[PDB]
Design a protein around this ligand. Structure first.
Ligand SMILES: CCCCCCCC(=O)OC[C@H](COP(=O)(O)OP(=O)(O)O)OC(=O)CCCCCCC
Ligand SMILES: CCCCCCCC(=O)OC[C@H](COP(=O)(O)OP(=O)(O)O)OC(=O)CCCCCCC
Ligand SMILES: CCCCCCCC(=O)OC[C@H](COP(=O)(O)OP(=O)(O)O)OC(=O)CCCCCCC
Ligand SMILES: CCCCCCCC(=O)OC[C@H](COP(=O)(O)OP(=O)(O)O)OC(=O)CCCCCCC
Ligand SMILES: [K+]
Ligand SMILES: [K+]
Ligand SMILES: [K+]
Ligand SMILES: [K+]
Ligand SMILES: [K+]
Ligand SMILES: [K+]
Lengths: 327, 327, 327, 327
């Protein structure tokens, strides 16, 4: 009844508080939402359009263009047809977007106006490039990527090849592969060291074959991950009855390079002591039909009872062999 | 005669069925075909062009512009020269593309029309950016990348340095390298555990040197991968005659970071029991000519018989030594 | 009092000198600062605008356009309305930016002028593309990325589970995870080999569990890294009093794939002999409140004394057991 | 005198011949040279500009526009001011580039002409996007990236800590780090197995500490890589005199994730038997000056003689100890 450290869906159940400070662009960019980033960029356009519009309007005002927007034989405006702020605003937009309808058109008359068109051209170009890049950042780096990996709802304890094992099933929801895929597991419980030190949650490795490289998996059809419960296992002393009492949690991990997303992935899940099914085995999901193999995923989470499974702990199992040898 | 789990070309022979649900953009993007994605984008242009065209047409209609498109001394249209829907449509296109010929040109007269030009400018800019990004997504993340790695058509069993070995050849088709390249192999067969549990396809590691780090290869010219068949090998009890009987499959893997594609790669192949050549050795592909080394790839798949190869299993080989020692 | 090889913040304290030579674009690009890269691109625009402007001006000059910019019935200019260098300059800008107001407009009259517009169009397009790319390079590859990982200010020496240990704490400042995270540590001191060879700084591994795969960590809430001090440890012979004398440094590393930045990361820190707190333990940062777990980061760096901690070295600790056994 | 398998600069000395076939875009793109890719894109522009120009010219021809380009009260051209092929060509360019000067301007008159402007707009947009992407491909994936890692010109054999060792030096030419850096080495020679099989070049691991994880290095200042020559070493039986006779090659590798280029890297070099200096040691490159450490890279390749170095092989060294024990 303690609590869930990692949720069934992989989400971690911890919140951070009281964090100190630092007084980056790429991370900041991908962290913001679409609607806000698009609002941001449209704001960037408006502001720059309005700014230059204001400048061209000032220039026109001072030059006397407002009273002679089309010019004549004796008089040439800085920008043709700026008759007021709305016109200046339009000329700004038309310049920066590069629409350039041309009714409002810069002339050779004013160095400053020519300068301002050069500047706005460069700015408009810079802004666009930043928008193209930010849109790719948030594009190729989404926070929501759909889980490509499935863990079974339950783990189970059963005999395989003379050994009592903790077992859980992993699967790939896509035809795409996972490169250099490998698995890990941890038992999560609080504990007090013999020296009296309290460890709120201790993370204790569950051996899935790392030392022989057998934690490395080639995952096509769903695979059943195996933990042999032995002297070195944290579950060594745990019997079926201990299970309905004990408060602990097992975190399971699958890591690898997903050929779809191109990025290294960590898929997570969790089994509470109460979510482990003793004396059970998974229903087979894999079937061969003539020319081809098929996986039926509706059997993925399903299990069946194996009543011949011993109800004592692995430690009892071992100790009993040594007890009936000597006598 | 059972069936092929992995095809010679690396393709996996399994199909998934009965999958449950989830109710992403980047993955969705790269999964669609070119012609459809290009059709999609052209559709995006049409729709937005038609939409704004419709809006400018409504504005023109209500303002009375249709009857005075060029305006006069007493009357100024919202957008010059919109005389009907085709003209409005053109003005829309010309605005969003930023072509801006200028015959059809927005004026200062109508706040709403100016507003709409601003909006369309932003939208056109957003659309373009998404097209530039999607085209890179599908660009830098192709599904068809040409296999850069070659496995020999056959594996073989022969003596090397006093040991009976399973051997197969791998090669790089490019001058480009593979960083942190390493190999793996698995024997694939169904089996029943002593407890009566049926495993439709069990995946059993074939030791290629992982424990000594010898599974790690520096691949320039083709290399012959070696599996010593010993007590711990699944092939320990298999003789030449067992081979023409037995139903099983060996999957071979090569993983590494391809310096060409920049992405971590898994190259796969398969050898059926019937595709393993007992008492054979690969023809050498590597030759030194004066100043330089050359590889002749026409010898890559070729093998020759070594009649002195023992036809008994490795287990017989060992057991026989112990049988002629003691006597 | 020797010196700091690695700073507390991970920065390395070494400078390179007397480096020889090589007589790339992507690296060169990301190495330059924003303001200089933006200045660079604006310079690229100016230069190309000025160049073509000069060319159109020459063409106009030679054709006689300067004296008849608008043309007439008997005479057609190469580019309409180029009346001087400022006009030519404007036409250049208007062409390359694709603003194209159209008052200055190329005609069918001069093959060379048409040619030049084609060329400038291609160049302007090339320049833009390079600017869009460079801006992404520097965008997705920043030098300043905010440290996502925290090391405790101090390490400590205390008993855990019957063993004297060197301990330090690591933490993730973000809810984002670290894929395939693992840790390392080194003792840095100069030394002289028995053969008389001087090694200015020798880097000696501190065992954090690599051989059992226990150097691999699943990091959610802060974790305390453990080095058991034993026969094989460089700290085996070091007591509490040796600590206030000895001159040495311990470098701690955490490597992994950060799910935020998408890139493989190396976080670093350092503990001088004087920064190690003997007979101390870290304050717990992790607390369970009902439905959820919380981390209080204000306790991250904090420690408390454990007076029962032995002040002798691990070697003394061992040797003393063997001394009181035999008697 | 045999030959060089790997050049001092890391380049591999092998050429492939007689390769079979496959009947991708991203790889193909980055493989082509700049000048050709830029020529390619400019060709793409020309072709599309010429094509549509031809179409608008046909349309104009058939409509009768060539004889009335400006139109009048009773007659409206499909595109204003197309008076011939040069004009049509200009209108094409002006449309696709989106310059849109506007002297040549499409009208509402011809559905086909409007259609063609829509099509060309989409095509021009597609072409541009492909150019922006290809330029990034070749941008972020260069073939020439400057070597960031240096190997010493020579290896050496000397005693360190009671053991005869093969040694070579590696260094980072940049302040940038290498994440998860690790080293490897191989002895390359042809050999004949006891069964009579010829291996043109056999690649035999040289143990740099892989089993203890000591092949993993934290590289700041140059480091001297160590191979202890022992029973399991291929160099076990090699003395100083054997060195001036023997024909063999040692390939050295350094792999890691370069924080600069963001990509996993393999740096390579080679030492011929003749390039190994027996009874030598590297000059120290690292020096501490007060507040800071410095590396002098002009000492990087330099070595000095250690006359006390034994000239016999490691095997002799061992065997001699056992010879003077027993007597
Ligand atoms: C009123 C809100 C209008 C608006 O801004 O919606 C944006 C939409 C909403 O996304 P949202 O912000 O909910 O997503 P996050 O929660 O992950 O941030 O996101 C797009 O896909 C735009 C794709 C644009 C594709 C254009 C080419 C087809
Ligand atoms: C009628 C079909 C017209 C059309 O859309 O063909 C597109 C072509 C077809 O590709 P396809 O869809 O067969 O490929 P996938 O099966 O992998 O999806 O794909 C390009 O290379 C476009 C490159 C454009 C390059 C432009 C600059 C040169
Ligand atoms: C006078 C200096 C004017 C100017 O050039 O400042 C640039 C600014 C300064 O950056 P700085 O060069 O200091 O950064 P580095 O030290 O890392 O190089 O960098 C931006 O963020 C531009 C973001 C542009 C975003 C545009 C869309 C909103
Ligand atoms: C006559 C040849 C004209 C021409 O095309 O030269 C291109 C130049 C030559 O490169 P080159 O083809 O020799 O390089 P590779 O051997 O690696 O392919 O490459 C650029 O940097 C263009 C950078 C353009 C940057 C534009 C913005 C400043
Ligand atoms: K334009
Ligand atoms: K334009
Ligand atoms: K125009
Ligand atoms: K090991
Ligand atoms: K990796
Ligand atoms: K225009």
């Amino acid at each position: 009844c303690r609590n869930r450290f990692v949720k069934k869906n992989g989400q971690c159940n911890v919140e951070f508080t009281n964090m100190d400070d630092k007084p980056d662009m790429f991370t900041t960019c991908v962290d913001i939402r679409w609607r806000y980033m698009l609002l941001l960029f449209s704001l960037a356009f408006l502001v720059s359009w309005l700014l230059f519009g204001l400048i061209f309007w000032l220039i026109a005002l001072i030059h006397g263009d407002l009273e002679n927007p089309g010019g004549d034989d004796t008089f040439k405006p800085c920008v043709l047809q700026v008759n007021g702020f709305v016109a200046a605003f339009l000329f700004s937009i038309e310049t920066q977007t590069t629409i350039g309808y041309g009714f409002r058109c810069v002339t050779e008359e004013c160095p400053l106006a020519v300068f301002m068109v050069v500047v706005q051209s460069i700015v408009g170009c810079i802004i666009d490039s930043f928008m193209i890049g930010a849109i790719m950042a948030k594009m190729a780096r989404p926070k929501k990527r759909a889980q490509t990996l499935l863990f079974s709802h339950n783990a189970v304890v059963a005999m395989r090849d003379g050994k009592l094992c903790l077992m859980w099933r992993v699967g790939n929801l896509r035809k795409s592969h996972i490169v250099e895929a490998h698995v890990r597991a941890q038992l999560i419980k609080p504990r007090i060291t013999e020296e009296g030190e309290y460890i709120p949650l201790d993370q204790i490795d569950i051996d899935v074959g790392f030392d022989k490289g057998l934690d490395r998996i080639f995952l096509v059809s769903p695979i059943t991950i195996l933990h042999e419960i032995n002297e070195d296992s944290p579950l060594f002393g745990i019997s079926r009855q201990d299970l309905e009492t004990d408060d602990f949690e097992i975190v399971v991990i699958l890591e690898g390079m997903v050929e779809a997303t191109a990025m290294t992935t960590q898929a997570r899940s969790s089994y509470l002591a109460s979510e482990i099914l003793w004396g059970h085995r998974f229903e087979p999901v894999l079937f061969e039909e003539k020319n081809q193999y098929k996986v039926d995923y509706s059997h993925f989470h399903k299990t069946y009872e194996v009543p011949s499974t011993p109800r004592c702990s692995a430690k009892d199992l071992v100790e009993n062999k040594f007890l009936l040898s000597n006598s």
